[PDB]
Amino acid sequence: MSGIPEITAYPLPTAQQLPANLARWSLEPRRAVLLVHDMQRYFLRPLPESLRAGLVANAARLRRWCVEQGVQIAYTAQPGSMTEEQRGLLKDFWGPGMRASPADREVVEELAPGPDDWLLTKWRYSAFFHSDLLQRMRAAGRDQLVLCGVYAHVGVLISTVDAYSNDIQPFLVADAIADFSEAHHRMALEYAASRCAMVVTTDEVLE
Amino acid sequence: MSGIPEITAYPLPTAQQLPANLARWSLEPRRAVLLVHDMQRYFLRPLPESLRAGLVANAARLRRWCVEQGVQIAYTAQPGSMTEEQRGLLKDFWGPGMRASPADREVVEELAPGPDDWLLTKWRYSAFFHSDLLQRMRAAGRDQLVLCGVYAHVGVLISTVDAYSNDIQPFLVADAIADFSEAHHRMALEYAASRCAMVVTTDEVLE
């Protein structure tokens, strides 16, 4: 039914474990949006508590810096109880998906959105898909995307590829994302570093 | 400059080597388009001849069946000599890219397009990106996509994800694609089989 496997605890990667970046982009707060990708109760429940805790603590530190620095915050979130037509081919790998109840669809309390933050409805793997994220970024004059959330190798990475494709420089925060296993996470980082993003740790972002 | 590594010969995967499909879609010619992805001279030149040969022979058998069966053929192809603005962030991983000369941009002779085949201009990793592929598929009443070409883990896979996202059932032809290494190819197949496609061999398609 969910498409989500049993997840074993693993350590988030450190600066020294990161693949080398081949790009040379530099994050400027005035240009940037922080995408908090799918940090909903339903997607964090499969994580072992040690991994959930590390994830959320980094994502929260990232979000406070962004706020201190003038970076636009944005949240993606699936609506829940998608109808059969709305769900489409997600059904075949992921089931009917989460319910539209607070217990599933709420952003976790530690990342609670504020009134200036963009709220995007999430339909498919990419945050840009059937959303107004791109149009909003253009209209705010922001052309850099900082990414955090879950799952690294699926929506996070596809959102990264879409931003890149739109000539928006992405910054993938390697210890403020989580995944199905350490090997999935690592492969997402390798792919990002050589095909669509700068990969950085939360500390590196905060400088 | 090109972003494309030195490529070592490897065998195309056989039916027995394929990851298990988790989906249960079945290809119907009347519903389908064959996407011949980026089978241009410039992208095939880095392949060792043994790998190029196997690739093109399967892609050609696939294309003849498709034609015999009523499947709509479509080709993506980069225009060549992209300007700096047109190239955008491709520059940072792939250089200025191919020239607009026949020696770079032509579809290889063994896959020569015919007058009924769709010709799409390729701008970014996905075939759907800044193209009319989706609109054309909708207008032809076709909701299945068969994919062949290069490179498996980059444009081919991202094109697959985009089709899937649009509720178009994809069919990734595992021995009619090629990649940077066997491990890249295999990982693309694993990703497709569990996240966005049916993975099949050319023989399996021809039945």
Ligand SMILES: CCCCCCCCO[C@@H]1O[C@H](CO)[C@@H](O)[C@H](O)[C@H]1O
């Ligand atoms: C499903 C897709 C899986 C691919 C994961 C790895 C993607 C990035 O692969 C990278 O390829 C570069 C050559 O281009 C190599 O030099 C790098 O060492 C490797 O990390």
Ligand SMILES: CCCCCCCCO[C@@H]1O[C@H](CO)[C@@H](O)[C@H](O)[C@H]1O
């Ligand atoms: C850069 C992205 C790299 C990821 C490559 C593998 C993607 C598919 O990974 C799959 O995950 C399933 C759990 O969901 C496992 O059961 C499978 O054995 C594994 O092949």
